[PDB]
Every structure is written in C-alpha cells, then in structure tokens.
Amino acid sequence: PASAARRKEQELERSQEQALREKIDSVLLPILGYGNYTAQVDIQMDFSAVEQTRKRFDPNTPATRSEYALEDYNVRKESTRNFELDTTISHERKQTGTVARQTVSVAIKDMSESEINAIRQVLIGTVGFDQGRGDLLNVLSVKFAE
Amino acid sequence: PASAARRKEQELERSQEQALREKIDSVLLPILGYGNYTAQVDIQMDFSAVEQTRKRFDPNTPATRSEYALEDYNVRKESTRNFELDTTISHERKQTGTVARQTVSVAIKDMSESEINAIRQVLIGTVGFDQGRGDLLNVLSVKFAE
Amino acid sequence: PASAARRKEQELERSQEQALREKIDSVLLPILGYGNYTAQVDIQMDFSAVEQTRKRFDPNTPATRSEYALEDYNVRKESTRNFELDTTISHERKQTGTVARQTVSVAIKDMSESEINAIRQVLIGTVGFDQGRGDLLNVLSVKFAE
Amino acid sequence: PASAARRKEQELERSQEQALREKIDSVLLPILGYGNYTAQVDIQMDFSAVEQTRKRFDPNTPATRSEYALEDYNVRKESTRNFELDTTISHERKQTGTVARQTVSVAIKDMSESEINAIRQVLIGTVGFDQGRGDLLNVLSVKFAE
Amino acid sequence: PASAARRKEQELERSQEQALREKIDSVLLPILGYGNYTAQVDIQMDFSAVEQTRKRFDPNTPATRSEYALEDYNVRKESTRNFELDTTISHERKQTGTVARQTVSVAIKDMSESEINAIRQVLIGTVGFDQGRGDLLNVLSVKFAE
C-alpha cells in the first residue's frame, strides 16, 4: 500500500547524505590527513505536488477591431469600440523532492583564523553553501582525546 | 484492517530515532571517547492529509474588451464596459509524515563553558537544530558513577 | 465483531509505555547505577475521527468584471457592478491515536538540588516533556528499604 | 446474540485493573518491601456512541458579489447586495470505552508526613491522577496484624 | 512506480559532476603536476515542465476593410469602419533538466597573485563560468600536510 511511498524517501534522503559525505571526504583527506577531522551532514526535503496555470493579459497595447461613432451637433456623442488583446497561457508542473535546508559541521583536531577561513572557502565550493535556502556551514577546531 | 496503518508509523518513528542516534554516535565517539557520554533523541510527527486549491485574481491590471459610451449634453452620461483579468489556478497535495518537534539531550562525564559551547556548535550541524519547529537541544556535563 | 477494535488500542498503549520505559532505562542506568532508581510512565490517547472542510474568501481584494453606470443630471445616480473574489478550498483528515497526556515519575535512592535539577534537565530531552499537552514530570529522592 | 457485547466490556474492565495493579506493584515493591503494603484500584467506563456534525459561519468578514444602487434625488434610496461567506463543515465520530473515573487506595504497614507526601508524589506519575475526571488517590498508613 | 523517476535524476546529476571533474583533471594535471592540487564540483538542476502559448497583435499598423461615412450638413457625422490586424501565434515546450547553479573550488599546494589569476583565467574557459546563473568559481593556495 502506502507503506512504501515513505521508506523510499527515507532511503533517498540517506543516499544524498552518504554522497555528500563521500564528496566531503575526498577534499579534506589529502590536506588535513587521516584521522585529523570529523564531519557530518544532513538534508531536509519535501515531497509535495504543485501544479500551476497562469493566464496573463497586456492592457497597455490594445488593438481596435470594430468602431462606430456619432458626433451629432446642434450634442450627441456616442462611441462603440471592440478591442482584442494579447493572450498568454502557461501550464507548469513542479518537481517532487526539492532540497529545503542543508547543514554541514566540520571539526579539526588541534589553527589560526586564516587557515580556518581558507578551509571554509574551499568547502563552500565543494558543498554548495547557498544563503537563499538558509543553509548552515560551520567549521571549527577543538582538542581531541587520546 | 486498519491495525497496520498505525504500527507502520510506529516503526517508521523508531527507525528515524535509530538513524539519528547512529549519526550522533559517529561524531562524539572520536572526540569524547568510548563510554564518556550518553545521548538519546526523539521525534514527533503527524500523518494528516491536506489538499489545497487556490484561485487568485489581479485587480490592479484590468483590460478592457467592449466599451460603450454616451455623453448627451443640453446631461446624460452613460457608460458600459467589460473587463477581463488575469486568472491563476493552483492545486497542491501535501506530504504525510512531516516532522513536528525534535529533542536532543547530551550528558558528558566529568568541562569549561568554551568546550561545551564548541560541542553544542558541532552538534548543531549534525542534528539540524531549527528554531522554527521549536526543537530543543541540551548539552551538559555531570559526574558519573563507578 | 467490535471486540477487537479496543483490545488493539489497549496493546498499542501498553507498547508505547514499554518503549518509553526502555528509553528511560538506557539513560539512567550508566549514571545512577543498577538498582539505585525506579521509574514508571503512562500515556493516555484518544481514537476519534475528525474530518474538516474549509472554504475561505478574501473580501479586501475585489475584482470588477461588469460595470454599468448612469449619472443623469438636471439627479439619477445608478450603478450595477459584478465582482469576482479569491476562492480557497481545503479538505483535511485527522489522525487516529494522538497522545493526550504523559506522566513520568522518578525516584532516586538516597542528593542536593543541583544534581536533581541536572537529572531533570537530562530526562526532559529523553522524554519529550511538553507544557502544551499538560504533561507531568516529577523527579525526587527518597530513602529505600534493606 | 447481545449476551457477548457486555461480557467483553466486563473482561476489558478487569484487564485494565489488572494492568494498573501490575504497574503499581513494580514501583512500590523495591521501596517498601515484600508484604509491607496493599493496594487495589478500579476503573469505571462508558460504551456510548456519539456522532457530531458541525457547520460554522463567519459573519464578521462578508464578501460582496453583486451590488445594485439607486440614489434618486429631487429621495429614493434603494440598495440590493448579495454576499458570500466562509463555510466550514466538520464530522466527528467519538471513541467507545473512555475512562470516566479512577480510584486508588494504598495502605502502608507501620511513617511521618514527609514520607507519605513523597510516596503520593511518586504514585501520581505512575497512576495518572487527574482532577478533570474527578479521580481519587488515597495513601495512608495503618497498623497490620500478626 | 514513481521511485524510478527520481533516482534517474540522481544518477544523471552524478554523471554530470563526474564528467566535469574529468574535464578539470585533464587541464590541471600537466601544468601543476600529480598530487599538487585537489578540486571538486557540484551541479544543481530542476526537472519542471513548462508549456507556453503566446498570441500577439500589432495595433500600430491597422488595415481597413469596410468603411461607411455620413457627413450631413445644414450636422450629422457618422462613421463605421472595420479593421484587420496582424496575428502571430507561438507554441513553445521547454526542456527538462536545465542547469541552475554551478560551483567549482580549486586548492593548490604551496604562489603569487599573477599565477593564481592565470590559472583562474584558464579554468574559466574549461568550466564555463557564467554570471547569469550565479555560478561560483574559487581558486586558492594552501599548505598541505606530510
């Protein structure tokens, strides 16, 4: 029944996180080294279904088709005009599974501020940090344990 | 009958908690160590079904189609106009199983305030702490037993 | 017949309590120890069935379609206008088995006030104590028997 | 025939009492000891069947559809307006077997007032004592026999 | 069912990234050397479906077909004209899978500013950096590990 329509979304969300983690590991491994960093990510998405239909008009450019006028003097002023305007019709079907938010957190074993800024700048391209969706990207250094 | 439509939600909710716990363990294990921390999470969700239909209009941009006027002087002032406006139709089907609230609690075996703040900042990205849904995230340190 | 529609709810309610007790035990066991605490929980739920249908209108943004006017002077002032407004239709089906109230009671074998407050703060995240549903959470220390 | 529709309720009521007694025993046994307390509970419930249908309106936000006016001076003042309002329809089916009242009585073998208050506070969470349904919870200490 | 309509998009997006990475590697390998650089890319795309229908008119060039006039003097001035205008009809079906954004990040093992600018200029042609889609291209040099 419907028990399979949600678990598929659950596995898809997990697969996205796994791919993002794999992409993250490829960049930080040769620069920081093995076992000198930890990172985890998560993605939240929605599976709604939206259909849109739009019909627009242009009132600034009217075109006349039939026109009748009467200008009786002595004072009758009668006018009857027909107009035809531009018509635009649009039909749109949205996607299902758009990414809503994305959070990335990176911890580096103990670094000055310049190196942290450089690492953040490098990771920005690798991740796709975008402010429109309210994504969060944090990178920081702490002392590990032995 | 309907006895299977709720137990599926119960197993799905448990599976979400298990995955979140597994993600939590991966980050805190190498930094804090084995047996130096405990953490548990819970998620509350709803399984409603909402359908939406919207029809919008634009009254600020009217377009004229037929127009008749009479300006008899001597004083008859008659007007008859027909208008056509923009039409927009939208149909939306919402998802079933959206997350409502999320609570995370972390206890660390005995730490200064800076380390606690750093750990909270690290866990924020790993969990997905969001203030819009009223999620709760608490991290603190207590003395364990022997 | 209908003798099975209520016993299923009875087993579901018992299963929820068992899972909550298991979650409680996992956190308090390593911090307090074996046999130094007791705790029990209960959950009350309802199994009603509610369907909702809503139809909303926007009276602040009217759009004119047909308009006729007469401004006879000498003083006839006649007007006839047709309007079209935004229409919104919503249909909602609620869930069956929502949690109404939740009570948790914890007794610790003999503790200062700070440790009690810390334990309560830890258990708040583990349980999901929410004031909207009027949930109750009590933690206290008493002297056991030998 | 109908001889089975009531005995099922009788066994369900007995099963609820048995489960509540089992939950009570689990908490008081390690704190008070074996054979130092006695307790019994009862639950009263109803098995009615109620269906509800509601139709609500919003008179404070009317929307105009058709309007005709006449303001003849010399003094005829005629108006004809049509309105459309928000419509809400709800259908609800209640549950069968809601708990009406609940009484708990606890006797402890001979205790100061503080210990009695602490025991009552512990049992409140374990039972679910609620004042809305007029539930009764009594705990007291008497001298047993030998 | 629909579980295959999204995984295909997931593999297509991964294939685009793989091809872009392969193109990147071909240029930077002979100039920088083996193991002296790291780079990763990502592409975000949408899979909507848009159909467009347009009907345009030219009101500045009207052509007369039938004309009747009356210029009675003594003063009746009556005119009745019919017009025919240019008509244009367009139907368009958009593509599915257009690229929305593109981010590239390059790190070079430790370089002056001139060499960095030259490398960025070289990579601009190889990637296709375009400001219309808000693409991001970052190139920088950091100290690696040993």
Residue numbers in the entry:
A (entry chain 3), B (entry chain 2), C (entry chain 1), D (entry chain Z), E (entry chain 4): 254 to 327, 367 to 402, 418 to 453
The publication says:
A total of 228,461 particle images extracted from 5,962 cryo-EM micrographs were analyzed. They were separated into two classes in the 2D class averages, with them showing either 35- or 34-fold rotational symmetry on the S-ring. No other symmetry in the 2D class averages was observed, indicating that the purified MS-ring consisted of 35 or 34 subunits of the FliFG fusion proteins, and there was no other variation. Because the MS-ring in the native flagellar motor is thought to comprise 34 FliF subunits, it is inferred that the 34-fold rotational symmetry structure reflects the native S-ring structure, whereas the 35-fold rotational symmetry structure is an artificial structure induced by the overexpression of FliFG fusion proteins alone. After postprocess without symmetry correction, their resolutions of 35 and 34 subunit MS-rings were 3.76 and 4.28 Å, respectively. Consequently, we built the atomic model of the S-ring part (RBM3–β-collar) at 3.23 and 3.33 Å resolutions from the maps of both classes after C35 and C34 rotational symmetry corrections, respectively. The monomeric structures in the S-ring part from the 35- and 34-mer structures are almost identical (RMSD = 0.286 Å). Our S-ring structures are composed of 34 or 35 molecules of the FliFG fusion protein. Their diameters differ: the outer and inner diameters are about 26.0 nm and 9.6 nm, respectively, in the 35-mer ring, and about 25.2 nm and 9.4 nm, respectively, in the 34-mer ring. The difference in the outer and inner circumferences derived from these diameters is approximately 2.4 nm and 0.7 nm, respectively, which are roughly equal to the calculated differences produced by one subunit.
